[PDB]
Amino acid sequence: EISGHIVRSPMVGTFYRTPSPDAKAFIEVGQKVNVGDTLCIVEAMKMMNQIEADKSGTVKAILVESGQPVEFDEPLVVIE
Ligand SMILES: *C(=O)CCCC[C@@H]1SC[C@@H]2NC(=O)N[C@@H]21
């Protein structure tokens, strides 16, 4: 059985769950995202790699661990 969809970081940077401290937190666990919705930023050299969920579904968890540097092909967020 498939485990949904997993999003692996395309490059290296810095994962996160809550951008601008004065925000509403990005797509965290138990969250709902639809093809066309935001996801999160990578923060690679100040590029704001703000990804946008394009597979719809409900986030299951994160393996990259926000606040931690990102690496090529890193499960940023796994959707259910
Ligand atoms: C880049 O100019 C310096 C670091 C910027 C950090 C960014 S702002 C939105 C995210 N939230 C946070 O705490 N850090 C990320």
UniProtKB/Swiss-Prot annotation:
Q: What is the lineage of its organism?
A: Bacteria, Pseudomonadati, Pseudomonadota, Gammaproteobacteria, Enterobacterales
Q: How does it assemble?
A: Homodimer.
**Domain of life, source organism:** Bacteria
Q: Which residues of the full protein are shown?
A: 77 to 156 of 156
Using the record's annotation, list all stretches that form the Biotinyl-binding domain: 1-80
The species is Escherichia coli (strain K12)
Question: GO terms for biological process?
Answer: fatty acid biosynthetic process; malonyl-CoA biosynthetic process
**Where are residues bearing N6-biotinyllysine located in the sequence?**
46
Query: What is the role of the protein in this entry?
Result: This protein is a component of the acetyl coenzyme A carboxylase complex; first, biotin carboxylase catalyzes the carboxylation of the carrier protein and then the transcarboxylase transfers the carboxyl group to form malonyl-CoA.
| UniProt keywords, alphabetically | Biotin, Fatty acid biosynthesis, Fatty acid metabolism, Lipid biosynthesis, Lipid metabolism
GO MF annotation, one: molecular adaptor activity
Q: In which pathway does it act?
A: Lipid metabolism; fatty acid biosynthesis
Q: Does the keyword Lipid biosynthesis apply?
A: yes
One GO CC term, this protein: cytosol
Q: What is this protein called?
A: Biotin carboxyl carrier protein of acetyl-CoA carboxylase
